[PDB]
Structures are given as C-alpha cells and as structure tokens.
Amino acid sequence: ACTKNAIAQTGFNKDKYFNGDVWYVTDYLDLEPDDVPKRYCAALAAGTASGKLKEALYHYDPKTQDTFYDVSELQVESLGKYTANFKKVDKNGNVKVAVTAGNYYTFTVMYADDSSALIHTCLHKGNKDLGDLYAVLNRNKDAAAGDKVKSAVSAATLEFSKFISTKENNCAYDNDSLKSLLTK
Ligand code: HEM
C-alpha cells in the first residue's frame, strides 16, 4: 500500500533535473521495508527526448543477479510530480513487456540540486504496489549523502539513519544504455 502524498520541491528546476544525465540511487527507504531487498542496485536517466519527458530505469539485485531496464514517458500532475506508465525493455530499448494501464509509477522530486536529489515513488504493477519508496540520488555513484540532501530527508519528517545504502554491493552501471534508452 502507498500512503504518502509526497510534496515536490518548492521551486523545482525541471530542466536541470531532466537534463539527459544519469542519477544513481545511493540510499533508499521503503515504508514497507519487506517489499524490496535489503541489498539492491538502481539508477535512472531523466531527460526530454524529442519533446517528450522521459525516464529510463535500471534495477539490479546484486545477490540474485535479477536485471531489468524500463523506459517511460512521464505525464505531468504538477511541477515535480509525475505519473509514468512503463515498458520493460532490454538495454537496447527492445520491448519485453509493453506499456499497459495498470503498470505505472508516481514520481515526486522532493528536493534536487545539481548533484543530489530526494525522490518518492509509488509503483503500481496491476493490483500490486511496492510501497512508499524514498530514494536519495547522486550524480556520482560513490557519493556519500551530503548535508543538503540529508536536511531534505529530515524536512520530509524522515530519518536518513534509517535509509539503506547501496554502496557496499559492487554496483556497476551501463550509463550509455541509460542515456540511449531515453530516446526509446
Ligand atoms: C527512482 C527509483 C525507482 C523507480 C522509479 C522504480 C520503478 C520501478 C518499476 C517501474 C518497476 C517495474 C519494472 C517492470 O516490471 O517493468 C520496478 C520494479 C522493482 N523495483 Fe523499483 N524503482 C525504483 C527504485 C528501486 C529501488 C531502490 C529498489 C530496491 C531497493 C527497487 C526495487 C524494485 C523491485 C524489487 C522490483 C521488482 C518488483 C516485481 O518483481 O514485481 N526499485 N521499480
């Protein structure tokens, strides 16, 4: 179940966030913690491609090796808050599971600057959801969370100490695929 109406950053700069570059998840918190593994790897690219607002996602379970990519065109609900219907693709953008009604995520940018961000997502996959999932992002996959983003975690009435880091999982990413997938 998702339970939070995440508030988007006041003054969110959409063009900076959606600049075509990659964001790495460094830390995450699911309010239903058993919905996701204790060890995980994830990243995304976010950009406008031929006028269309896009995200490309990458998930990797470092223990099971379960791997998947997704592409979505985001619809705007308000500045910094989006609804994304996703398609599972291979790294080259070939469709494995087409877009469908019931497959979407919400995506709220709670805080962002040039290097760091805090997001909330609620994933819906038919009648399943994966809970309220918060993620700390950085442009540098190895960056420890700094004071701007940690303060934003506090401002959301969360505790950064409870987030799970992705940093000790040997995560290696294909940035080229993420960038190219924005067009797909
Ligand atoms: C920016 C952040 C994230 C977004 C927008 C997001 C989005 C999604 C989407 C769209 C799917 C469905 C993929 C498909 O079936 O095509 C998915 C699945 C999944 N995500 Fe995420 N995710 C994010 C971060 C994470 C993180 C950090 C974790 C783990 C800690 C995670 C764990 C999972 C798992 C385990 C699944 C598979 C669910 C299933 O097998 O049905 N995700 N996510």
Curated annotation (Swiss-Prot):
Disulfide bonds join C2-C122, C41-C171. GO terms for cellular component: extracellular region. Binds 1 heme b (iron(II)-protoporphyrin IX) group per subunit. SUPFAM superfamilies: Lipocalins. It catalyses: 3 nitrite + 2 H(+) = 2 nitric oxide + nitrate + H2O. Gene3D superfamilies: 2.40.128.20. Heme binds at H59. Its EC number is 1.7.6.1. Changing D30 to A/N: Loss of NO-induced conformational change and strongly reduced pH dependence for NO release. Stabilization of the ferric-NO heme center and decreased nitrite disproportionation. It is an enzyme of class 1 (oxidoreductase). Its cofactor is heme b. Salivary gland (at protein level). Keywords: Disulfide bond, Heme, Iron, Metal-binding, Oxidoreductase, Secreted, Signal, Vasoactive, Vasodilator. GO terms for biological process: vasodilation. Belongs to the calycin superfamily. Nitrophorin family. Superposition of the structures of NP4 in the presence of ammonia or nitrite shows a conformational change of the protein upon NO(2)(-) binding. Heme-based protein that delivers nitric oxide gas (NO) to the victim while feeding, resulting in vasodilation and inhibition of platelet aggregation. Reversibly binds nitric oxide (NO). Also binds tightly to histamine, which is released by the host to induce wound healing. NO release is pH dependent and linked to loop dynamics. This is Nitrophorin-4. It comes from Rhodnius prolixus.
